[PDB]
Structures are given as C-alpha cells and as structure tokens.
Amino acid sequence: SHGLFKKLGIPGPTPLPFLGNILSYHKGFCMFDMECHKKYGKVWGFYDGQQPVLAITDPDMIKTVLVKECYSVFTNRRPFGPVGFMKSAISIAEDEEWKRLRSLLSPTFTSGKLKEMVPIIAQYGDVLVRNLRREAETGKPVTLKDVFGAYSMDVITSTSFGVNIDSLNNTKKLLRFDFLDPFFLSITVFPFLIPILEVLNICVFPREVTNFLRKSVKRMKESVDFLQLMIDSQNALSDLELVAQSIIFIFAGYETTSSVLSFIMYELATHPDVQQKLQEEIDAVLPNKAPPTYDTVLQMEYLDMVVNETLRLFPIAMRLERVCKKDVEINGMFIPKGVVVMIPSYALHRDPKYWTEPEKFLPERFSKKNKDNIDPYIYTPFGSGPRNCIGMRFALMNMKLALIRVLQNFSFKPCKETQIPLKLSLGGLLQPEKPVVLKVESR
Amino acid sequence: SHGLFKKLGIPGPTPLPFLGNILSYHKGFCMFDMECHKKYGKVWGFYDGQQPVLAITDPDMIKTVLVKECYSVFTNRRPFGPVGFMKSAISIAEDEEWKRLRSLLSPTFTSGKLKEMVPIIAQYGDVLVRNLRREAETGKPVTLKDVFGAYSMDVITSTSFGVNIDSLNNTKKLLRFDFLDPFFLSITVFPFLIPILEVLNICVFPREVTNFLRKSVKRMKESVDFLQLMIDSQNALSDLELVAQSIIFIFAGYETTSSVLSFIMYELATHPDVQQKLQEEIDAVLPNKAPPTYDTVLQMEYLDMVVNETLRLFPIAMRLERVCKKDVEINGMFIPKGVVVMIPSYALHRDPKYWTEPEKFLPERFSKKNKDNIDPYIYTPFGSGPRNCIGMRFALMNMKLALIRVLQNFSFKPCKETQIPLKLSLGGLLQPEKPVVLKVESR
Ligand code: HEM
Ligand code: HEM
Ligand SMILES: CC(C)(C)OC(=O)N[C@@H](CS[C@@H](Cc1ccccc1)C(=O)NCCc1cccnc1)Cc1cccc2ccccc12
Numbered sequence: 033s034h035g036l037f038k039k040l041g042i043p044g045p046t047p048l049p050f051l052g053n054i055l056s057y058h059k060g061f062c063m064f065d066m067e068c069h070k071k072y073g074k075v076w077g078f079y080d081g082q083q084p085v086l087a088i089t090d091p092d093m094i095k096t097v098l099v100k101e102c103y104s105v106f107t108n109r110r111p112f113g114p115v116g117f118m119k120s121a122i123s124i125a126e127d128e129e130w131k132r133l134r135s136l137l138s139p140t141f142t143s144g145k146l147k148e149m150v151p152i153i154a155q156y157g158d159v160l161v162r163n164l165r166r167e168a169e170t171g172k173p174v175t176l177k178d179v180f181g182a183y184s185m186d187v188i189t190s191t192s193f194g195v196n197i198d199s200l201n202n203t204k205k206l207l208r209f210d211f212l213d214p215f216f217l218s219i220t221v222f223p224f225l226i227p228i229l230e231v232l233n234i235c236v237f238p239r240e241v242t243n244f245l246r247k248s249v250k251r252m253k254e255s256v257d258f259l260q261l262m263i264d265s266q267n268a269l270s271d272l273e274l275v276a277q278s279i280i281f282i283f284a285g286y287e288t289t290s291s292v293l294s295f296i297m298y299e300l301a302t303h304p305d306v307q308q309k310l311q312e313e314i315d316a317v318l319p320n321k322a323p324p325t326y327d328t329v330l331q332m333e334y335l336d337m338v339v340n341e342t343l344r345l346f347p348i349a350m351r352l353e354r355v356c357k358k359d360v361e362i363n364g365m366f367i368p369k370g371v372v373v374m375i376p377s378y379a380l381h382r383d384p385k386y387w388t389e390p391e392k393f394l395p396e397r398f399s400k401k402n403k404d405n406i407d408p409y410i411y412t413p414f415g416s417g418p419r420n421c422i423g424m425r426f427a428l429m430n431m432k433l434a435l436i437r438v439l440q441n442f443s444f445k446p447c448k449e450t451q452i453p454l455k456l457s458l459g460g461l462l463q464p465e466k467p468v469v470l471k472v473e474s475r
Numbered sequence: 476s477h478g479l480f481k482k483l484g485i486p487g488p489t490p491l492p493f494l495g496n497i498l499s500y501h502k503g504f505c506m507f508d509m510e511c512h513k514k515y516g517k518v519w520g521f522y523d524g525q526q527p528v529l530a531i532t533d534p535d536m537i538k539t540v541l542v543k544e545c546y547s548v549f550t551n552r553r554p555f556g557p558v559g560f561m562k563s564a565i566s567i568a569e570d571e572e573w574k575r576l577r578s579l580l581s582p583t584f585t586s587g588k589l590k591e592m593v594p595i596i597a598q599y600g601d602v603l604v605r606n607l608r609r610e611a612e613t614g615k616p617v618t619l620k621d622v623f624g625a626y627s628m629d630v631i632t633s634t635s636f637g638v639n640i641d642s643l644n645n646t647k648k649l650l651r652f653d654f655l656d657p658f659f660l661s662i663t664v665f666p667f668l669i670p671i672l673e674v675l676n677i678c679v680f681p682r683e684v685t686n687f688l689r690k691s692v693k694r695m696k697e698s699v700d701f702l703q704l705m706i707d708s709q710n711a712l713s714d715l716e717l718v719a720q721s722i723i724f725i726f727a728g729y730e731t732t733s734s735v736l737s738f739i740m741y742e743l744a745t746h747p748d749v750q751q752k753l754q755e756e757i758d759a760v761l762p763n764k765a766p767p768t769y770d771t772v773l774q775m776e777y778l779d780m781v782v783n784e785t786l787r788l789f790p791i792a793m794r795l796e797r798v799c800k801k802d803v804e805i806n807g808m809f810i811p812k813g814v815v816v817m818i819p820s821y822a823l824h825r826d827p828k829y830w831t832e833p834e835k836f837l838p839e840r841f842s843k844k845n846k847d848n849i850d851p852y853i854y855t856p857f858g859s860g861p862r863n864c865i866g867m868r869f870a871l872m873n874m875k876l877a878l879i880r881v882l883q884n885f886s887f888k889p890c891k892e893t894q895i896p897l898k899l900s901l902g903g904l905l906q907p908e909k910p911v912v913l914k915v916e917s918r
C-alpha cells in the first residue's frame with residue numbers, strides 16, 4: 033500500500049514500513065511541507081502510516097477541491113477519533129448530516145446578526161482596557177494570551193448564549209486538546225485502534241472538560257441567540273447534538289481569537305512604525321476614543337492589512353484537507369478514492385514564487401495598490417468553498433473590535449524575556465514555544 | 476476455558492461466553508459474593524471473563540494463602556493495568572521487586588516512628604474542631620467526608636513529607652480512581668487490551684493528577700521522614716519509583732482514613748447510646764479534654780470496639796485476592812496455576828454461622844469477654860500475612876486520635892436528609908450512594 037504514489041508517477045519521500053513518512057515530522061508539519069514543496073514541486077505525495085496524502089499547490093486544483101468538486105467528491109475532512117458523542121459536531125460531521133447542520137447554523141453570523149453583537153462586544157472591550165491598565169500601571173510584563181483569552185471567553189459566551197463572567201480566574205476549562213506525540217502518533221499511523229477506544233468511552237477530549245461543559249449547557253435553558261436558534265430549529269435535533277455544537281463554538285471562540293490577537297501584538301511591537309501607522313488611523317476613524325461600531329471596523333483598511341499579514345505568517349490552519357470519496361481526474365491528474373488531498377497552507381503562505389520577502393512582516397502586501405497580486409487560492413486563512421470557516425466574518429470582527437479598543441489606550445514594547453525571534457511551536461498545533469510577553473504603556 | 480471449575484468439581488454459576496459471570500455484578504461485588512456463599516457453600520468458582528476465580532471461606536485455607544504459602548505461591552495480587560509508571564508502586568509490584576520495596580518501607584511505621592507522629596497529628600486535631608465549630612455554631616448539616624478528608628490530607632502530608640495545608644479548598648486532586656462500569660468492564664473481561672493502552676501512555680490514573688503530583692514531589696526535596704527514609708536508602712531506587720510510592724501513601728492516607736471515619740460517625744449517630752458510652756470513656760481516660768497521647772489511644776478499649784465493628788460492617792476491602800503462581804494442593808484441594816484465589820471478605824464479615832445478628836451494629840462482639848469467639852481469618856479488615864496493610868497500625872492510630880478530639884467537643888445527630896438506612900454504593904468501591912450528612916452540636 034506504500035507504492036501508490038510511485039504508481040501514479042507522483043514524487044515524494046520514500047516511506048518506511050508501517051510508519052510511512054511520519055519520522056519527517058520531527059521539525060513539525062510545516063517545515064516538512066516547505067521542504068517537500070521545494071524538493072518535489074507543485075504536487076507530491078507522502079504517507080501518514082497507510083493513509084496516502086496528495087499535497088497540491090495548484091490554485092486551479094485547490095479551487096476545484098475546495099470550491100468546485102466539494103459537494104460531490106471532497107466533502108469530508110480526514111476522520112478524527114475517538115471522539116465519543118462529539119461525532120455530531122459540525123466540523124467532524126460527514127455527508128448529509130453535515131449539510132443538515134451547516135445550514136442549521138449558517139444564519140448565526142449574518143450581517144444583521146453580527147451587527148447586533150457590536151453593542152455586546154463593546155462592553156468587554158472596556159474590561160480589557162481596565163485589566164490591562166492594572167498590569168500597565170505596575171510595570172509588569174503581561175502574558176497577552178491570558179488576558180486576551182480572558183476577553184474572548186466573555187465575548188463568545190454572551191454572543192451565542194447569554195452568560196457573562198468577569199475574570200474569576202464555562203470557567204474556560206477549555207484547557208484540553210493537547211496535540212503532540214503519543215497517543216496521537218499511534219492513531220494516525222495505526223488507525224484501526226480508533227474503533228477500540230470508541231467502544232471503551234475513551235475520548236481524545238478529557239471527561240472532565242466534557243461533563244463540565246455537558247452540564248453547564250443544561251443551566252443554559254433559562255425560561256435571538258445561537259442557542260435560541262437551535263431549539264427554534266428543534267421544536268430533528270438531539271438534546272446531545274446541541275451540546276456538541278456548543279463545545280465547537282466555545283473552543284474556537286476562545287483559543288483562536290486569543291491566539292491570533294497575541295500573534296498580532298507580537299508583530300506590532302517588533303515593528304514600532306507599523307503600530308504608529310495603525311494607531312494614527314484608529315484615531316482618524318474614531319477620535320476622542322470614539323466607540324467602535326460595525327461600520328467603522330469595516331472602514332479601517334490598515335487594520336485589515338495588519339490582521340491578514342499576521343494570519344499569513346501564522347496560519348492557524350497550516351494545512352487544509354478533504355477526503356477524496358471516489359475516483360476523479362482533476363486538472364489532468366487522476367486521484368484514487370481514499371486519498372486525502374491536502375493543501376499545505378503554511379508553505380503556500382511563504383512561497384517565494386508568490387510573495388516578495390515572505391518571512392518579513394509587511395502589511396503593504398495587502399494594500400489595495402497590491403492586493404490584486406494575491407491569489408485567493410494561495411492565501412486562505414479561513415479556508416474556502418462551502419466548508420470554509422463558518423465563523424470567519426465574526427472572528428475578523430471580534431479581533432478588529434478589540435484591536436481598536438486596546439490600541440486607542442495603550443502601546444506595546446518588547447521585554448527582555450520576549451522571545452525574539454519567536455520560535456513556533458515545533459510541536460503540532462500552531463503556537464509559540466515560549467508564551468508572548470510584552471510591555472504595556474498607557475497613553 | 477470456561478469449564479475449569481466444572482472439571483475440578485467446584486460449584487459455581489454458569490458463565491456466559493466471553494462475559495463469564497460479570498452480569499451477576501449488577502448488584503455489586505458484595506451482593507453476588509453473599510448469594511454464592513449461600514448458594515454453593517465453603518468453596519466455589521466463577522469467571523471474570525476468562526480469568527477463573529476460586530472463592531475460599533475456610534479459615535485454614537485462608538491462613539494458608541495469606542500467611543503460609545505466601546512467598547512461594549500466592550505472592551502477587553490480580554494484575555492492574557494500564558498504569559504506566561505506577562507499575563513500581565509497592566501494592567501493584569510483583570515477586571522480587573515487591574519484596575525489595577516492602578522491606579524498604581516497613582520501618583516507616585514502627586512504634587518508635589508512630590509515637591513521633593502523635594505531636595504532629597495533635598495539631599490538626601484542633602483545626603478539625605474549629606472547622607467543625609463553624610458548621611456547628613451555624614446549624615447547617617455537615618458533609619463529614621469533606622471535613623474528614625480535609626483532616627486526613629493535612630496529616631498524611633506532614634507525617635511522610637513535611638508540607639502542611641490549612642483548608643484552602645497536594646491540593647487533594649486525589650479525585651480520580653473512579654471505579655465502575657466501562658472502561659473497567661472491558662479490561663477485566665477482555666484483558667489483552669491492557670498492553671494496547673500501555674504503549675499509548677494511556678493510564679487508568681488521569682494525566683492531570685499524575686503530572687500535578689509528579690511535579691509536587693519535586694518541590695519535596697527541600698535542602699526522619701518517609702521521604703527522608705527513601706533518599707537515605709537511595710544514596711538502587713529510581714527518582715520516578717520514589718514518586719509512585721508517594722502517590723500510594725497520599726491516596727490511602729486521604730481516602731480510606733476519611734471514609735472509615737465517615738462510616739464510623741454514621742454508626743454513632745444511629746445509635747445514641749453507643750456514642751454516650753464511648754464519650755464517657757474518652758472523658759475517663761482524658762479528662763478536662765486532656766491531649767490524647769500514643770499510650771492513651773491504645774488504652775481505650777471501647778474506641779477499639781467501635782472502630783472494628785464499623786470496619787466489620789464496611790470492609791473497604793470487600794475481597795482479598797492472590798494470584799496462584801504454580802500448581803498446588805492446599806487443604807486437600809488442587810488449585811491450578813493461574814487461578815485467582817479470592818477471599819470474599821464482605822460476605823465473611825456477615826456470615827450468620829460466625830456472627831450473631833450480622834447486620835446489626837453491635838460493638839459488644841469485639842469485647843474481651845467475647846473477642847475469643849472471633850476467627851482472625853474471617854475478620855481481616857487489614858488483610859493478613861506478609862502482604863497485609865502496611866499502614867494498618869498508623870491508620871488505626873490516626874482514626875482513633877481524631878475520634879477522640881472530636882467526641883470530646885461535639886455530638887452527632889441524624890438529619891432529615893441523612894440516608895437511613897444508608898444504601899451502599901451499588902457500584903464498585905465501598906462507598907455510600909448519598910454522602911453522609913449529620914447534625915453537629917457543641918458540648
Ligand atoms: C482567526 C480566527 C479563525 C481562523 C483563522 C479560522 C480558520 C478556519 C479554517 C481554516 C477552517 C477550515 C476551513 C476549510 O477546511 O476550508 C475553519 C473551520 C471552522 N471554523 Fe474557524 N477560524 C477562525 C475562527 C473561528 C471562530 C471564531 C469560530 C466560531 C464558531 C469558528 C468556527 C469554525 C467552524 C464551525 C468550522 C467548521 C467548518 C465546517 O467543517 O463546516 N472559527 N476555521
Ligand atoms: C482503615 C484504613 C485501612 C484499611 C481498612 C486498609 C486495608 C488494607 C487491605 C485489606 C489491604 C490488602 C491486604 C491484603 O491483601 O492482605 C491493604 C493494603 C495496603 N495498604 Fe491499607 N488499609 C487502610 C489504610 C492504609 C493507610 C493509611 C495506608 C498508608 C500508607 C495504607 C497503605 C497500604 C499499602 C501500601 C498496601 C499495599 C500492601 C502490599 O501489597 O504490600 N493503607 N490495606
Ligand atoms: C489541525 C489539528 C491537527 C491540530 O487537528 C484539529 O484541530 N482538528 C479538528 C477537526 S478540523 C478543525 C479545522 C482545522 C483544520 C486545520 C487546521 C486548523 C483547524 C475544526 O473544524 N475545529 C473545530 C473548531 C475550530 C477550531 C480551531 C479553529 N477553527 C475552528 C478537531 C477538533 C479540534 C478542537 C476542538 C474540537 C471540538 C470538537 C470536535 C473537534 C475538535
């Protein structure tokens with residue numbers, strides 16, 4: 033089974049038996065994807081155990097898989113287990129059950145619904161300043177992820193449910209999902225062990241965080257919100273499926289929002305001029321520290337360039353994947369049934385044949401003077417096509433709203449302990465080795 | 476393999492294939508052991524999957540297995556996995572590695588060392604009264620296990636290490652070891668799945684409590700104690716084996732001490748006369764609320780009768796087991812290699828052919844006028860022989876010391892919510908269904 037890509041004439045590193053090519057993951061997913069993108073070219077294949085992976089970098093081929101041939105062939109992501117009752121979570125769900133859930137939740141983030149959330153997000157923007165002013169009046173390096181995470185948690189809890197929480201350090205036991213070496217190295221490389229753990233109620237999500245969130249949502253039936261949108265569409269949605277969806281939203285609303293914001297601040301400190309240009313624009317659109325509104329956030333263009341260049345340098349995706357569910361021949365390339373087509377997003381976001389000086393932080397790539405020279409199937413921080421990020425527009429809102437309220441009040445300088453250059457987590461997920469600490473100064 | 480006991484002419488319930496007799500565990504271990512002890516007699520056999528179990532109730536046969544033929548045949552308990560690095564814990568350890576550890580820790584609880592711990596245990600006895608006086612001056616039903624557990628934790632931490640903690644509710648993340656239905660039903664009945672989970676770092680003890688206790692012991696190398704006894708015998712003991720032993724002591728020092736004390740209080744409230752007779756003796760040996768000392772505790776005889784009758788009614792053991800490691804013929808009964816000889820302690824502690832009115836709490840069984848009519852191989856709350864409870868003498872001390880300090884100061888009456896009669900946990904471990912709540916009144 034380790035000779036499929038040799039058959040199709042698709043290059044790739046030689047796999048060791050059983051292990052495939054996982055030993056190349058010692059420098060992490062991303063360093064391996066960049067190496068092969070240089071070593072082999074536009075299309076190559078490797079193995080995660082006995083699961084062949086077809087990496088494609090052709091924008092047409094990427095558009096065909098993400099957008100064109102989505103509903104017919106490339107509908108599902110690579111399977112993820114054991115998960116227990118989280119099998120109904122939309123992002124894991126497959127085929128018709130996913131389509132049923134995706135439409136069931138698409139009206140959550142309409143521009144009408146997102147506008148309604150601006151007065152709610154406006155409250156916790158001030159709690160963020162106050163919690164910052166404390167660690168600013170005392171010259172004490174601030175761990176941004178702790179205070180950003182404290183902010184994103186309060187926002188996602190109210191925008192989708194109705195519960196608040198003010199720093200009583202729903203308590204954000206969102207402390208699981210620790211990706212790394214075993215026991216994930218075993219499952220991806222030895223896959224039929226997943227049905228074993230499933231029948232044992234063994235779950236990659238710990239029992240503590242689940243039963244804690246399993247009950248907490250029950251207190252959320254106080255007698256239009258996301259949860260208010262689910263019972264109105266239940267009145268056939270299970271009582272347990274509703275919780276699985278909730279857990280998806282709370283996690284992504286906390287981790288990803290606080291992570292990208294932290295990455296964003298590290299970039300603004302390491303480039304003081306960029307932070308000046310961005311602060312000068314926020315005072316131009318919202319003077320006297322004017323309250324940021326839905327229409328002002330979409331107006332700020334440099335803010336959007338700072339968000340996207342950060343997302344370019346730190347794609348919290350790294351890869352996009354779809355399982356090819358039947359034989360096809362996309363763009364003159366036959367692809368057998370079962371292969372996992374993979375888009376190496378991280379490598380694509382640094383390919384010198386698309387970006388000038390790819391490693392340097394330069395918001396000016398995404399200027400309207402230059403954003404024409406940017407292929408939207410090379411740069412897809414929120415994915416693309418029917419199965420792209422369902423929270424994209426809301427997340428770009430929540431991040432931009434907070435970036436405004438903070439930059440109106442403080443500035444950010446590096447510390448002695450600030451890791452420069454920042455080493456990415458050579459592990460699995462896209463994080464830093466050492467956390468991000470920056471000095472905060474009040475204006 | 477389900478026909479061994481049919482071969483040996485040893486009666487027992489018919490096993491279903493694969494499952495054996497585990498379906499009889501619906502009423503818990505103990506109800507099943509009492510039924511068979513009546514249904515079949517002095518010796519019977521069943522199956523926990525494909526592991527046959529020989530239950531023996533003959534005192535001679537019990538003495539032979541626990542005491543006589545211990546070192547040669549019945550050395551090890553039934554195997555317990557997956558456990559990870561806890562394989563070196565003395566209570567799991569086997570053959571020569573256990574003997575090495577058992578001698579290495581036997582001098583921990585000498586009468587010289589136990590006497591040294593009385594002035595230490597005397598401190599937290601007063602914190603127990605104060606924490607009781609709060610919930611006593613406010614007529615609020617008290618959960619005994621919470622406050623007893625808060626006490627036993629402070630005692631075991633200092634008597635073996637040197638760290639204290641005063642109710643800041645080592646924080647006693649001793650909240651794992653949840654025995655019950657799956658995934659334990661799978662392992663005991665389907666056993667070769669244990670080596671699977673072992674190679675995945677999967678562990679019946681959660682990673683949170685381990686890494687929390689794995690590090691906390693490192694802070695315990697401040698530059699004669701249990702820990703002080705281990706490095707002096709290390710100067711070949713591993714750095715990791717030392718932690719595994721510690722985890723054994725902290726758990727048993729917290730859970731079992733607080734559990735038996737809770738059971739003891741429920742019995743004293745449901746029998747007001749017994750509590751009067753016990754309080755009258757404590758005032759006779761320690762008047763003016765005299766501080767309890769090593770020699771006064773061993774002097775109190777009714778205190779000892781209240782502890783043992785409670786332990787008779789609630790054997791935190793329920794069963795004792797040893798793996799028969801080679802073919803033998805004990806007491807005219809051949810026993811093949813591999814069988815798990817089992818002593819059904821709970822059933823034996825209520826056999827009407829040894830105790831008069833076995834279900835009624837009656838301290839007067841264990842009076843020196845009657846303690847001759849009590850077979851020490853029927854009543855073994857601390858086991859027996861070389862592998863009996865290594866903490867027995869210290870636990871009987873710690874419990875009796877606390878029972879004195881509390882009964883000197885308060886009395887205990889039932890509540891409206893106090894479960895009467897107390898339903899045992901129909902689950903696995905020996906606990907109650909509903910927790911024990913009792914009214915506290917100051918004298
Ligand atoms: C900077 C923030 C975020 C980024 C960069 C991001 C990116 C992504 C990406 C790349 C995907 C996979 C898309 C694909 O396979 O084509 C995805 C999926 C998803 N995201 Fe996000 N996301 C972000 C924030 C959020 C937020 C705030 C939510 C709130 C609910 C959210 C909910 C989801 C869901 C439910 C999916 C599942 C998509 C499906 O299979 O239908 N994301 N996201
Ligand atoms: C009421 C309190 C306790 C009771 C009823 C009790 C009872 C028992 C029993 C029945 C056994 C198995 C004996 C056998 O198989 O023959 C045992 C083993 C053990 N107990 Fe306890 N115990 C108590 C408290 C403690 C305490 C406070 C410690 C403190 C360290 C402790 C440490 C141990 C250890 C290390 C073993 C392992 C024996 C071995 O395999 O060498 N126990 N206990
Ligand atoms: C990537 C790796 C190897 C670390 O593995 C996974 O992250 N794979 C998840 C399933 S694909 C994930 C989308 C995604 C793909 C690639 C990169 C980043 C995200 C997705 O849709 N995530 C749902 C919410 C979310 C998270 C982050 C950003 N946007 C949205 C498995 C997973 C992760 C975390 C929480 C989960 C909760 C319930 C069910 C599955 C969960």
Ligand SMILES: CC(C)(C)OC(=O)N[C@@H](CS[C@@H](Cc1ccccc1)C(=O)NCCc1cccnc1)Cc1cccc2ccccc12
Pocket residue numbers: 552555561564566567652654722723726727731791792793794795903904
């Ligand atoms: C009994 C059942 C099915 C619930 O299973 C186990 O309890 N079987 C344990 C291994 S035999 C246990 C002795 C024992 C036998 C029978 C009944 C009660 C106790 C033993 O020696 N326990 C060590 C400390 C202790 C506990 C209680 C009382 N006295 C001492 C497995 C086990 C349990 C708890 C913590 C552990 C920590 C490290 C390694 C193993 C551990």
